[PDB]
């Protein structure tokens, strides 16, 4: 999920207000990328041996 | 994109791999509006002429 698009539907003002919260969207995106990498590693370990 | 990835990874050197930098989207040209066909008009003829 794209945090900015999910929180604000292409609203510049909403994005600006969300920016005041910090870097929560970046952390969530990093967590999702790590989850995807973990899934890829899991399937590689399960099958590619 | 090399400099973009350098900004993303907080370093001047980036290792070989894949990294997410940002997101992309397009914008509406101006707008579009669609309304139903004009129905029968009010008989203003018998009122005016």
UniProtKB/Swiss-Prot annotation, chain A:
Domain of life: Viruses
Disulfide bonds: 3-25, 8-14
Known function: Precursor of the fusion protein processed in the biosynthesis of the S protein and the formation of virus particle. Mediates fusion of the virion and cellular membranes by functioning as a class I viral fusion protein. Contains two viral fusion peptides that are unmasked after cleavage. The S2/S2' cleavage occurs during virus entry at the cell membrane by host TMPRSS2 or during endocytosis by host CSTL.
Protein name in the entry: Spike protein S2
Lineage per the UniProt record: Viruses, Riboviria, Orthornavirae, Pisuviricota, Pisoniviricetes
Gene designation: S
Residue window of the full protein shown: 736 to 784 of 1273
């Amino acid at each position: 999920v794209d945090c900015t698009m999910y929180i604000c539907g292409d609203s510049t003002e909403c994005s600006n207000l969300l920016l005041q919260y910090g870097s929560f969207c970046t952390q969530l995106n990093r967590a999702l990328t790590g989850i995807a990498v973990e899934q890829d590693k899991n399937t590689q370990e399960v099958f590619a041996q | 994109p090399l400099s973009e990835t350098k900004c993303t990874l907080k370093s001047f050197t980036v290792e070989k791999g894949i990294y997410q930098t940002s997101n992309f989207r397009v914008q509406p040209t101006e707008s579009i509006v669609r309304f139903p066909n004009i129905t029968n008009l009010c008989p203003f003829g018998e009122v005016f002429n």
